[PDB]
Symmetry: C3
Subunit: 114 residues, 3 copies
């Protein structure tokens, strides 16, 4: 998994340990080793959700498989959970776009995963 | 709709009002309640288009359906129009990537839209 | 092609001419005129790869065609190569998501490419 969070929450509100926590929890959730997982948090963004500038997040999760109805519902519960607990963002002010990438369409280490 | 604009125009050149305007215009254009609409503007970016650092924008619009030939042509007119009028970006220096998301592949409120 | 790189490398470490070099090299790789090529570099990011905050990058390449097994392998070698040489990022700490966009789903100059 690679997970990207873009939020209007300020940098000083992202707690120490957050990228490590995301990494571990995504490892646990996907049954994938943590060495594969990438995470990225972009705070201080100029964003709105429903025309409001209260805390919100626009996120992406990309995986090579392990994407599907049930799996995505569990990922959304985990990730909204974390964003609510650590960043004080309401789950109904979060979108997470999920992408099932073909191995041939993911570059890594001078080649692809195909 | 959720609309993201990345641009090398400076923060101070983004009008107060712009996120609200995008939200309202997007609501009009899609017929979606504005409560569902998210917008995000990212100024000051290190970017080039055609090798030039003249104002430009890289954007995305994600929707659950309501994406297709005619619809995307109308969105591109609307959104290039706004970026030209408000951020003084030439329409020929804008890209908009459109994504028709499956409901099961959009997380929100601890679950998905499926 | 449009290429976006997000990295925890600091802005001061991005050398002069980097966006110009990406443009020119992407033109060469895809055969496409540099005039349509967009590039975007986002340094100083809060990111981790494999649970580690060593230099890393998460990137995307969108093209209307010119995406496929061998092409993307070639692009990955090219781009990981530039990121290593210029930003001192190890190739094994780079992910590049490739997107073959339908021409109907790419907005430019008030319309789409369909």
């Amino acid at each position: 998994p690679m997970f990207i969070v873009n939020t209007n929450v300020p940098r000083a509100s992202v707690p120490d340990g957050f990228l490590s926590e995301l990494t571990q929890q995504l490892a646990q959730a996907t049954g994938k080793p943590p060495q594969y997982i990438a995470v990225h948090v972009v705070p201080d963004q100029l964003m709105a959700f429903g025309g409001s500038s209260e805390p919100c997040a626009l996120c992406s999760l990309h995986s090579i498989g392990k994407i599907g109805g049930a799996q995505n519902r569990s990922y959304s519960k985990l990730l909204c959970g974390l964003l609510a607990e650590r960043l004080r963002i309401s789950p109904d002010r979060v979108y997470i776009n999920y992408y099932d990438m073909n191995a041939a369409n993911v570059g890594w280490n001078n080649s692809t995963f195909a």
